[PDB]
Design a protein around this ligand. Structure first.
Ligand SMILES: *[C@@H]1O[C@H](CO)[C@@H](O[C@@H]2O[C@H](CO)[C@@H](O)[C@H](O)[C@H]2NC(C)=O)[C@H](O)[C@H]1NC(C)=O
Lengths: 49, 45
């Protein structure tokens, strides 16, 4: 996948977290991308390996 | 025997230490995947 710059690989899944309405993606402790927001529909999706 | 139960219910530092050391090392291992070591970035892409 590529989300307007974020390049990665994995399974995408519907989320149930709530970003603040200016945050694009979420990170874990140890700093790995684990959630994104879809630019077009603006919904949060988790990224599992 | 009734007082052991109070003193614990209210001390396992040697067991907590082992756990903490291993987690602190595993986190340092992953946090190194974002250093350059003298390169232009940290990403192969
Ligand atoms: C980007 O464009 C798409 C369409 O090209 C937008 O999709 C629309 O979303 C609304 C939801 O509010 C629907 O009612 C429309 O029917 C959708 N249009 C189509 C053609 O499917 C999308 O919302 C746009 N991105 C943003 C962030 O608004």
């Amino acid at each position: 996948f590529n989300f307007n710059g974020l390049t990665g690989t994995g399974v995408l899944t519907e989320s149930n977290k709530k970003f603040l309405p200016f945050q694009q993606f979420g990170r874990d402790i140890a700093d790995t991308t684990d959630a994104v927001r879809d630019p077009q529909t603006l919904e949060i999706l988790d990224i599992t390996p | 025997i009734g007082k052991i139960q109070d003193s614990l219910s209210s001390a396992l530092g040697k067991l907590q230490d082992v756990v903490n050391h291993n987690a602190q090392a595993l986190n340092t291992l992953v946090k190194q995947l974002s250093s350059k070591f003298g390169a232009i970035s940290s990403v192969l892409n």
